[PDB]
Amino acid sequence: GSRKIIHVDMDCFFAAVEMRDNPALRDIPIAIGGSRERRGVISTANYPARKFGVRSAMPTGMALALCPHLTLLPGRFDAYKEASNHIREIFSRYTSRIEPLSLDEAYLDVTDSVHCHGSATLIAQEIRQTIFNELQLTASAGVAPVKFLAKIASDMNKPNGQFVITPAEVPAFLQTLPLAKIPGVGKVSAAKLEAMGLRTCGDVQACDLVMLLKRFGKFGRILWERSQGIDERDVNSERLRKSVGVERTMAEDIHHWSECEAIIERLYPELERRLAKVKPDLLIARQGVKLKFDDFQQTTQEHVWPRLNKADLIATARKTWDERRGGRGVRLVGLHVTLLDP
DNA sequence: TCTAGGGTCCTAGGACCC
DNA sequence: GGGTCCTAGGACCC
Ligand SMILES: Cc1cn([C@H]2C[C@H](O)[C@@H](COP(=O)(O)NP(=O)(O)OP(=O)(O)O)O2)c(=O)[nH]c1=O
Ligand SMILES: [Mg+2]
Ligand SMILES: [Mg+2]
């Protein structure tokens, strides 16, 4: 009943692709992110950049203060998508039990594989190899009896390495495991738990499930379970995108409806183009808009609607602008579509 | 330094049903 | 009053 789960995760993904395609970027600090002037943030950075403290989700201003000679790149998403498609094709050779989580990551359930004598360690190392062949990119991997441990493990020995967690090692691994390493536990949750002296899975083990459930709910049950090493989430393989969105943050806050409208006129064709790729008839379940104000409060207004329609998006936007702006400047305008049910 | 843009899942009240 | 829809918002991941 104990499974064999692999998590595969490409190293410095976007940056890695950019270094392969331009070796002159190999030993200098580079990052993919928007410019400071455009209120950008770092999508990611190579190891030379990370040495300076540059991290994903860091505002570009801070990144440059930390690393003045940082070479900043706009991003080339078709290339990254090519790499992704390729590595998913590689995954398909060993199993059909594959759950992509993003361009550069995936779960594989190799519990019932005949490859590599059923050795998950060898399957994984062999998948890291041939990804380096064929693509000239490096991957890292985690091997564990369940999903979340495989995910934690893939991070343990990067870059270009893997880490294995056997059932026997699980209790010792968990006792020290800080709750923040658990996928789904972010800064807010971790801070809230750490307030009440809970730092590790060891602490949650000695904790009451009913207080945990009354306080956090479904999430609390999940925390308890993962703290016991319990994670029965199966690898899916049949997951479908549920929504499509296009938003933009402007270099300067806007204060006039005409500006918002102009933005939307530019946003719509991009949304139509991306929706058309999977939905040529543009039929949808809902559509709506998003505004984020200078106080960083964000509002969305969405409604049932049968087909992507620009005029309705503009009217909805105008109602939102007039009713919710409250004299504030607007830093972001967005359009959104909820895909049909099936 | 000054805070993206791509998304998923969960919560919560009211509508609606039964 | 529970189940499920609707809409709005937040936490989290990549
Ligand atoms: C975390 C993060 C990632 N990305 C992009 C760039 C990453 O290359 C790519 C993969 O995410 P990641 O695996 O979390 N970070 P990484 O792959 O670049 O570096 P590594 O996995 O730690 O080696 O997704 C963002 O655009 N914004 C982000 O906040
Ligand atoms: Mg990665
Ligand atoms: Mg990743």
Side-chain angles (χ1 to χ4, degrees), chain A residues 144 148-154 156 163-178 181-182 200-202 205 226-227 229:
Chain A
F148 88 101
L149 288 180
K151 172 92 197 67
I152 296 173
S154 69
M156 294 284 91
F163 190 88
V164 181
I165 302 177
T166 72
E169 300 170 329
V170 169
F173 186 81
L174 289 178
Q175 265 296 318
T176 14
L177 183 60
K181 292 284 186 179
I182 300 169
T200 59
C201 292
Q205 287 176 12
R226 311 267 184 89
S227 294

mmCIF file of all heavy atoms in Angstrom, chain A residues 144 148-154 156 163-178 181-182 200-202 205 226-227 229:
data_model
loop_
_atom_site.group_PDB
_atom_site.id
_atom_site.type_symbol
_atom_site.label_atom_id
_atom_site.label_comp_id
_atom_site.label_asym_id
_atom_site.label_seq_id
_atom_site.Cartn_x
_atom_site.Cartn_y
_atom_site.Cartn_z
ATOM 1 N N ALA A 144 9.845 9.835 -2.458
ATOM 2 C CA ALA A 144 9.208 9.667 -1.156
ATOM 3 C C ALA A 144 7.964 8.798 -1.277
ATOM 4 O O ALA A 144 7.484 8.561 -2.386
ATOM 5 C CB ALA A 144 8.855 11.028 -0.572
ATOM 6 N N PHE A 148 3.928 15.305 -0.729
ATOM 7 C CA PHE A 148 4.528 16.474 -0.088
ATOM 8 C C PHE A 148 5.968 16.233 0.350
ATOM 9 O O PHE A 148 6.798 17.146 0.311
ATOM 10 C CB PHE A 148 3.643 17.006 1.050
ATOM 11 C CG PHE A 148 3.900 16.375 2.389
ATOM 12 C CD1 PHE A 148 4.663 17.034 3.341
ATOM 13 C CD2 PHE A 148 3.341 15.152 2.716
ATOM 14 C CE1 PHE A 148 4.886 16.473 4.582
ATOM 15 C CE2 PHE A 148 3.559 14.586 3.953
ATOM 16 C CZ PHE A 148 4.335 15.246 4.888
ATOM 17 N N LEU A 149 6.269 14.990 0.717
ATOM 18 C CA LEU A 149 7.628 14.615 1.070
ATOM 19 C C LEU A 149 8.517 14.531 -0.168
ATOM 20 O O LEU A 149 9.692 14.880 -0.112
ATOM 21 C CB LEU A 149 7.644 13.292 1.837
ATOM 22 C CG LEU A 149 7.125 13.302 3.273
ATOM 23 C CD1 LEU A 149 7.217 11.916 3.879
ATOM 24 C CD2 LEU A 149 7.893 14.297 4.124
ATOM 25 N N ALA A 150 7.962 14.081 -1.290
ATOM 26 C CA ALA A 150 8.718 14.075 -2.537
ATOM 27 C C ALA A 150 9.060 15.504 -2.954
ATOM 28 O O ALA A 150 10.157 15.773 -3.465
ATOM 29 C CB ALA A 150 7.936 13.374 -3.626
ATOM 30 N N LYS A 151 8.110 16.413 -2.738
ATOM 31 C CA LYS A 151 8.300 17.827 -3.063
ATOM 32 C C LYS A 151 9.374 18.450 -2.175
ATOM 33 O O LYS A 151 10.282 19.118 -2.669
ATOM 34 C CB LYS A 151 6.982 18.590 -2.908
ATOM 35 C CG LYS A 151 7.104 20.106 -3.044
ATOM 36 C CD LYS A 151 6.872 20.565 -4.468
ATOM 37 C CE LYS A 151 7.396 21.975 -4.677
ATOM 38 N NZ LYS A 151 8.879 22.051 -4.583
ATOM 39 N N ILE A 152 9.274 18.231 -0.866
ATOM 40 C CA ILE A 152 10.306 18.713 0.051
ATOM 41 C C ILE A 152 11.679 18.143 -0.318
ATOM 42 O O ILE A 152 12.686 18.851 -0.305
ATOM 43 C CB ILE A 152 9.963 18.354 1.508
ATOM 44 C CG1 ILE A 152 8.685 19.073 1.946
ATOM 45 C CG2 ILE A 152 11.115 18.707 2.436
ATOM 46 C CD1 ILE A 152 8.173 18.650 3.317
ATOM 47 N N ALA A 153 11.698 16.864 -0.672
ATOM 48 C CA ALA A 153 12.930 16.162 -1.006
ATOM 49 C C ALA A 153 13.597 16.696 -2.267
ATOM 50 O O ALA A 153 14.825 16.770 -2.331
ATOM 51 C CB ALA A 153 12.662 14.664 -1.141
ATOM 52 N N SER A 154 12.803 17.058 -3.273
ATOM 53 C CA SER A 154 13.390 17.563 -4.514
ATOM 54 C C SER A 154 14.179 18.851 -4.273
ATOM 55 O O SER A 154 15.098 19.170 -5.028
ATOM 56 C CB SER A 154 12.324 17.771 -5.594
ATOM 57 O OG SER A 154 11.461 18.848 -5.278
ATOM 58 N N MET A 156 15.871 19.420 -1.423
ATOM 59 C CA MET A 156 16.910 19.141 -0.434
ATOM 60 C C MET A 156 18.325 19.139 -1.006
ATOM 61 O O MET A 156 19.269 19.578 -0.342
ATOM 62 C CB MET A 156 16.637 17.806 0.270
ATOM 63 C CG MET A 156 15.387 17.768 1.148
ATOM 64 S SD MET A 156 15.534 18.598 2.743
ATOM 65 C CE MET A 156 14.986 20.254 2.317
ATOM 66 N N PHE A 163 17.124 13.647 -3.767
ATOM 67 C CA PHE A 163 17.094 13.178 -2.383
ATOM 68 C C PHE A 163 15.985 12.153 -2.166
ATOM 69 O O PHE A 163 14.848 12.340 -2.614
ATOM 70 C CB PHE A 163 16.947 14.347 -1.406
ATOM 71 C CG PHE A 163 17.138 13.961 0.035
ATOM 72 C CD1 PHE A 163 18.405 13.956 0.604
ATOM 73 C CD2 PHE A 163 16.052 13.607 0.823
ATOM 74 C CE1 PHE A 163 18.586 13.601 1.928
ATOM 75 C CE2 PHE A 163 16.228 13.250 2.149
ATOM 76 C CZ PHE A 163 17.495 13.247 2.702
ATOM 77 N N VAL A 164 16.325 11.070 -1.472
ATOM 78 C CA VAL A 164 15.386 9.984 -1.231
ATOM 79 C C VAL A 164 14.965 9.910 0.240
ATOM 80 O O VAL A 164 15.806 9.931 1.139
ATOM 81 C CB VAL A 164 15.997 8.627 -1.653
ATOM 82 C CG1 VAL A 164 15.005 7.505 -1.423
ATOM 83 C CG2 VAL A 164 16.437 8.668 -3.116
ATOM 84 N N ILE A 165 13.658 9.833 0.476
ATOM 85 C CA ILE A 165 13.121 9.618 1.815
ATOM 86 C C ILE A 165 12.343 8.303 1.855
ATOM 87 O O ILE A 165 11.257 8.197 1.280
ATOM 88 C CB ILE A 165 12.166 10.751 2.237
ATOM 89 C CG1 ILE A 165 12.870 12.108 2.190
ATOM 90 C CG2 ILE A 165 11.608 10.485 3.628
ATOM 91 C CD1 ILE A 165 11.962 13.285 2.528
ATOM 92 N N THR A 166 12.899 7.305 2.535
ATOM 93 C CA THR A 166 12.247 6.009 2.683
ATOM 94 C C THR A 166 11.293 6.072 3.873
ATOM 95 O O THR A 166 11.433 6.954 4.720
ATOM 96 C CB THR A 166 13.290 4.898 2.931
ATOM 97 O OG1 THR A 166 13.822 5.027 4.253
ATOM 98 C CG2 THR A 166 14.424 5.007 1.938
ATOM 99 N N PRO A 167 10.309 5.152 3.933
ATOM 100 C CA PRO A 167 9.377 5.104 5.067
ATOM 101 C C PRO A 167 10.089 5.051 6.416
ATOM 102 O O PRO A 167 9.689 5.735 7.363
ATOM 103 C CB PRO A 167 8.627 3.794 4.835
ATOM 104 C CG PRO A 167 8.631 3.622 3.363
ATOM 105 C CD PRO A 167 9.918 4.216 2.861
ATOM 106 N N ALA A 168 11.142 4.243 6.490
ATOM 107 C CA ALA A 168 11.933 4.098 7.708
ATOM 108 C C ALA A 168 12.470 5.439 8.209
ATOM 109 O O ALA A 168 12.547 5.675 9.415
ATOM 110 C CB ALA A 168 13.079 3.125 7.467
ATOM 111 N N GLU A 169 12.838 6.315 7.276
ATOM 112 C CA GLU A 169 13.390 7.618 7.629
ATOM 113 C C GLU A 169 12.311 8.644 7.995
ATOM 114 O O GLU A 169 12.624 9.707 8.541
ATOM 115 C CB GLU A 169 14.236 8.161 6.476
ATOM 116 C CG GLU A 169 15.413 7.282 6.080
ATOM 117 C CD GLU A 169 16.068 7.738 4.784
ATOM 118 O OE1 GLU A 169 15.353 8.280 3.909
ATOM 119 O OE2 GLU A 169 17.294 7.545 4.635
ATOM 120 N N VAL A 170 11.048 8.337 7.699
ATOM 121 C CA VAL A 170 9.987 9.348 7.832
ATOM 122 C C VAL A 170 9.808 9.969 9.233
ATOM 123 O O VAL A 170 9.788 11.195 9.356
ATOM 124 C CB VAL A 170 8.636 8.874 7.229
ATOM 125 C CG1 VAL A 170 7.516 9.807 7.620
ATOM 126 C CG2 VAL A 170 8.736 8.797 5.715
ATOM 127 N N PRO A 171 9.686 9.140 10.289
ATOM 128 C CA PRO A 171 9.489 9.730 11.620
ATOM 129 C C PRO A 171 10.613 10.675 12.053
ATOM 130 O O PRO A 171 10.327 11.748 12.576
ATOM 131 C CB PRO A 171 9.453 8.502 12.533
ATOM 132 C CG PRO A 171 8.933 7.421 11.664
ATOM 133 C CD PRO A 171 9.566 7.671 10.330
ATOM 134 N N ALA A 172 11.865 10.277 11.849
ATOM 135 C CA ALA A 172 12.999 11.133 12.182
ATOM 136 C C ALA A 172 12.996 12.409 11.336
ATOM 137 O O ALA A 172 13.251 13.498 11.844
ATOM 138 C CB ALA A 172 14.307 10.378 11.999
ATOM 139 N N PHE A 173 12.716 12.268 10.044
ATOM 140 C CA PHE A 173 12.656 13.420 9.152
ATOM 141 C C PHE A 173 11.603 14.434 9.591
ATOM 142 O O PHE A 173 11.828 15.640 9.505
ATOM 143 C CB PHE A 173 12.384 12.986 7.712
ATOM 144 C CG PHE A 173 12.448 14.115 6.725
ATOM 145 C CD1 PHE A 173 13.669 14.559 6.239
ATOM 146 C CD2 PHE A 173 11.292 14.747 6.295
ATOM 147 C CE1 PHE A 173 13.737 15.606 5.338
ATOM 148 C CE2 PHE A 173 11.353 15.799 5.392
ATOM 149 C CZ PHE A 173 12.577 16.224 4.914
ATOM 150 N N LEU A 174 10.464 13.939 10.066
ATOM 151 C CA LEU A 174 9.346 14.797 10.454
ATOM 152 C C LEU A 174 9.545 15.542 11.774
ATOM 153 O O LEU A 174 9.149 16.701 11.889
ATOM 154 C CB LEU A 174 8.053 13.986 10.524
ATOM 155 C CG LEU A 174 7.470 13.534 9.189
ATOM 156 C CD1 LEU A 174 6.231 12.704 9.421
ATOM 157 C CD2 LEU A 174 7.150 14.739 8.331
ATOM 158 N N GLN A 175 10.134 14.873 12.766
ATOM 159 C CA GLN A 175 10.331 15.460 14.096
ATOM 160 C C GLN A 175 10.937 16.862 14.049
ATOM 161 O O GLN A 175 10.503 17.756 14.775
ATOM 162 C CB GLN A 175 11.202 14.546 14.966
ATOM 163 C CG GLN A 175 10.413 13.607 15.879
ATOM 164 C CD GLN A 175 9.604 14.350 16.919
ATOM 165 O OE1 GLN A 175 10.081 15.311 17.520
ATOM 166 N NE2 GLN A 175 8.371 13.909 17.137
ATOM 167 N N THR A 176 11.928 17.039 13.178
ATOM 168 C CA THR A 176 12.631 18.309 13.018
ATOM 169 C C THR A 176 11.992 19.214 11.965
ATOM 170 O O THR A 176 12.218 20.425 11.969
ATOM 171 C CB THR A 176 14.095 18.076 12.604
ATOM 172 O OG1 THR A 176 14.266 16.715 12.186
ATOM 173 C CG2 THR A 176 15.034 18.362 13.760
ATOM 174 N N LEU A 177 11.207 18.621 11.067
ATOM 175 C CA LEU A 177 10.636 19.337 9.922
ATOM 176 C C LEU A 177 9.836 20.568 10.326
ATOM 177 O O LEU A 177 8.756 20.446 10.897
ATOM 178 C CB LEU A 177 9.750 18.407 9.084
ATOM 179 C CG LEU A 177 9.140 19.026 7.819
ATOM 180 C CD1 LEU A 177 10.237 19.507 6.892
ATOM 181 C CD2 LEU A 177 8.229 18.049 7.089
ATOM 182 N N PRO A 178 10.363 21.763 10.020
ATOM 183 C CA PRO A 178 9.636 23.008 10.295
ATOM 184 C C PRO A 178 8.390 23.117 9.419
ATOM 185 O O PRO A 178 8.479 22.867 8.219
ATOM 186 C CB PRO A 178 10.649 24.093 9.917
ATOM 187 C CG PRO A 178 11.551 23.452 8.936
ATOM 188 C CD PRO A 178 11.646 22.008 9.338
ATOM 189 N N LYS A 181 8.140 24.356 5.713
ATOM 190 C CA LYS A 181 8.615 23.567 4.576
ATOM 191 C C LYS A 181 7.477 22.786 3.904
ATOM 192 O O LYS A 181 7.583 22.394 2.738
ATOM 193 C CB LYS A 181 9.719 22.605 5.011
ATOM 194 C CG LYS A 181 11.029 23.265 5.431
ATOM 195 C CD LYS A 181 11.818 23.750 4.230
ATOM 196 C CE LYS A 181 13.198 24.268 4.640
ATOM 197 N NZ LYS A 181 14.010 24.723 3.462
ATOM 198 N N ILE A 182 6.390 22.572 4.641
ATOM 199 C CA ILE A 182 5.217 21.893 4.103
ATOM 200 C C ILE A 182 4.529 22.759 3.040
ATOM 201 O O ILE A 182 4.172 23.903 3.306
ATOM 202 C CB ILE A 182 4.216 21.551 5.224
ATOM 203 C CG1 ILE A 182 4.860 20.628 6.260
ATOM 204 C CG2 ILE A 182 2.954 20.915 4.650
ATOM 205 C CD1 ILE A 182 4.047 20.460 7.530
ATOM 206 N N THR A 200 7.482 22.923 14.319
ATOM 207 C CA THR A 200 7.766 21.706 13.562
ATOM 208 C C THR A 200 6.603 20.717 13.530
ATOM 209 O O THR A 200 5.612 20.888 14.241
ATOM 210 C CB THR A 200 9.002 20.982 14.138
ATOM 211 O OG1 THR A 200 8.768 20.638 15.510
ATOM 212 C CG2 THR A 200 10.223 21.873 14.057
ATOM 213 N N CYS A 201 6.727 19.690 12.693
ATOM 214 C CA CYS A 201 5.755 18.599 12.662
ATOM 215 C C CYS A 201 5.743 17.846 13.991
ATOM 216 O O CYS A 201 4.718 17.294 14.388
ATOM 217 C CB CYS A 201 6.064 17.627 11.525
ATOM 218 S SG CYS A 201 5.817 18.311 9.873
ATOM 219 N N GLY A 202 6.885 17.831 14.673
ATOM 220 C CA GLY A 202 6.979 17.224 15.990
ATOM 221 C C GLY A 202 5.989 17.829 16.971
ATOM 222 O O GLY A 202 5.394 17.113 17.785
ATOM 223 N N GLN A 205 2.299 16.827 16.115
ATOM 224 C CA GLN A 205 2.053 15.448 16.536
ATOM 225 C C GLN A 205 1.505 15.397 17.966
ATOM 226 O O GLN A 205 0.555 14.673 18.260
ATOM 227 C CB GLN A 205 3.343 14.627 16.442
ATOM 228 C CG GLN A 205 3.781 14.288 15.013
ATOM 229 C CD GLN A 205 5.111 13.554 14.968
ATOM 230 O OE1 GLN A 205 5.612 13.096 15.991
ATOM 231 N NE2 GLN A 205 5.692 13.451 13.781
ATOM 232 N N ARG A 226 -0.316 15.694 7.475
ATOM 233 C CA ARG A 226 1.029 15.830 6.907
ATOM 234 C C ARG A 226 2.084 15.783 8.017
ATOM 235 O O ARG A 226 3.201 15.316 7.800
ATOM 236 C CB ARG A 226 1.172 17.126 6.091
ATOM 237 C CG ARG A 226 0.061 17.394 5.066
ATOM 238 C CD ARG A 226 0.360 16.883 3.664
ATOM 239 N NE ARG A 226 -0.699 17.270 2.727
ATOM 240 C CZ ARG A 226 -0.713 18.408 2.029
ATOM 241 N NH1 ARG A 226 0.277 19.284 2.145
ATOM 242 N NH2 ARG A 226 -1.719 18.676 1.206
ATOM 243 N N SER A 227 1.725 16.256 9.208
ATOM 244 C CA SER A 227 2.624 16.152 10.352
ATOM 245 C C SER A 227 2.824 14.701 10.777
ATOM 246 O O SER A 227 3.870 14.355 11.323
ATOM 247 C CB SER A 227 2.115 16.981 11.523
ATOM 248 O OG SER A 227 2.157 18.355 11.210
ATOM 249 N N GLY A 229 2.971 12.493 8.527
ATOM 250 C CA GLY A 229 3.489 11.914 7.297
ATOM 251 C C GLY A 229 2.386 11.366 6.408
ATOM 252 O O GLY A 229 2.654 10.725 5.390
#
